[PDB]
């Protein structure tokens, strides 16, 4: 295990006949050839851009690549046709290879109309190309009618990247390709499309979830099928669900907080696809996405050793731009990684020695303290490695003027290990919530986690709305309580859905749950609208809840998206009130995403 990481460009925007290349799919043929597929985009856009599905082949394990060839050719003139968003699926029992993609004419995903007739240009069709000669030549089929059991499903696309064939269970041999559909209610849902006859016929299973999008599946160590999805509702994380029936139907969808995502595609595969059911090796998954929540950047590989329950292991492969990626397992024990660096489509090859992980997921809880204080938090390491590590270390990534150190007891096979982290925060430090990184470093590899240190802010969990002048709840979720949920994506909104609703001034008052020394209020505006922004304000406080002292602070907030501080000399108070005197440009309504209170718990 000498570490290996290499890359090379396969398509470069503005070279070889297209101004833009995106949307990677990668597989290994029954004869060991690597196939890389992707869009060529004549007008640089998603469907219904007149796109082509392209393919390059490597016959030497990915070292060198042959000519760019056209699998499905778009038409830029009469009539306009596009083929976009490839996904490979190899039937390893028959040798047959499929490449799923859209067939667009007038409409893409958003515009597609109900119907399944291949001649209808108002439908985004579902196509599949089939090859029986290792991807040299292809025949083409439209399968929309076959995969549309509900005439309310007006639009669909196969998730680009690579589908799977089940190896375990009563449904062994089944081919599974994930799609996103839009139903008659307008929701985006995930669904598995599958074949039990080696691609002769395809059908849709039961749709799952809401706020879904491009999504992927993988067969777990016990033969359940794990679904991992882009979140069209923009949580900043991946969504997950599990099937016990070979991908036909799924349970409840949940967010996976250990998988940050900027709302984009990602890949998940078995590290050991031939490992037997129930084995340790069968539990190992690899994952690729952009780890940034704020841009398509910080492309990262992660590894789970427990069927995707935890993700102890991570390493950055692309610190810069990284706007799509797909993983495949190579015959030589390494992994291919076909991704978008911003320059087109790039092929990378890495091994597990490069990734450098140990299967030892660990936890550190979130902690609160005051500036000028120290606190110690416990560490719990679950050793899934099966080996002893006599001298593990813990390395923390925190503000450079803080003092942070930690330690962990030796790792033992099959056991939990304990540790600790002490944090000292200097006097004066600005109140806020501070993310802190932690890396378990061992001779056998590394694992990591993160936790939040809250400094100088009261506990929102003890706070409640004492009073508010107005709130919208009829047409949207504008609850006053939204200010104290720690989420900048949810907001208090004053009532707007009745004409008689009040205009300015507005007012929101918090019960802190108890009397505290306080010295500040932090305000965060509504993030996705500019027309209900607080401008002029006064802050008042109360020891007993009806008699208000103040203004203790006044001013005019800005249009900054970040927390804005209104500070005041320290005073004891059970209640704090924000009077919103005015809106930035005189609109009627007030919205606030967050309020936090600077004080001593
Ligand atoms: C058929 C189609 O439109 N595919 C496009 C998808 C969807 O539009 C989407 O995920 C729907 O919400 O978006 C991309 O992944 C994207 O965000 O860059 C590009 C991809 O080509
Ligand atoms: Na909020």
Curated annotation (Swiss-Prot):
The keyword Aminoacyl-tRNA synthetase does not apply. It catalyses: Hydrolysis of alpha-(2->3)-, alpha-(2->6)-, alpha-(2->8)- glycosidic linkages of terminal sialic acid residues in oligosaccharides, glycoproteins, glycolipids, colominic acid and synthetic substrates. Coiled coil: none annotated. Its EC number is 3.2.1.18. Pfam families: BNR_2 (PF13088), F5_F8_type_C (PF00754), NPCBM_assoc (PF10633). Transmembrane segments: none annotated. It is found in: Secreted. SUPFAM superfamilies: E set domains, Galactose-binding domain-like, Sialidases. It comes from the Bacteria. To release sialic acids for use as carbon and energy sources for this non-pathogenic bacterium while in pathogenic microorganisms, sialidases have been suggested to be pathogenic factors. The active site is at residues 46, 214, 324. This is Sialidase. The keyword Nuclease does not apply. Substrate binds at residues 22, 230. InterPro entries: A-galactase_NEW3, FA58C, Galactose-bd-like_sf, Ig-like_fold, Ig_E-set, Sialidase, Sialidase_fam, Sialidase_sf. Belongs to the glycosyl hydrolase 33 family. Its main location: secreted. One of its GO terms (molecular function) is exo-alpha-sialidase activity. Residues 450-600 form the F5/8 type C domain. Keywords: Glycosidase, Hydrolase, Repeat, Secreted, Signal. Induction: By N-acetylneuraminic acid, colominic acid, and sialic acid. GO terms for cellular component: cytoplasm; extracellular region; intracellular membrane-bounded organelle; membrane. It is an enzyme of class 3 (hydrolase). GO terms for biological process: ganglioside catabolic process; oligosaccharide catabolic process. BNR repeats lie at residues 56-67, 129-140, 193-204, 241-252, 302-313. The gene is nedA.
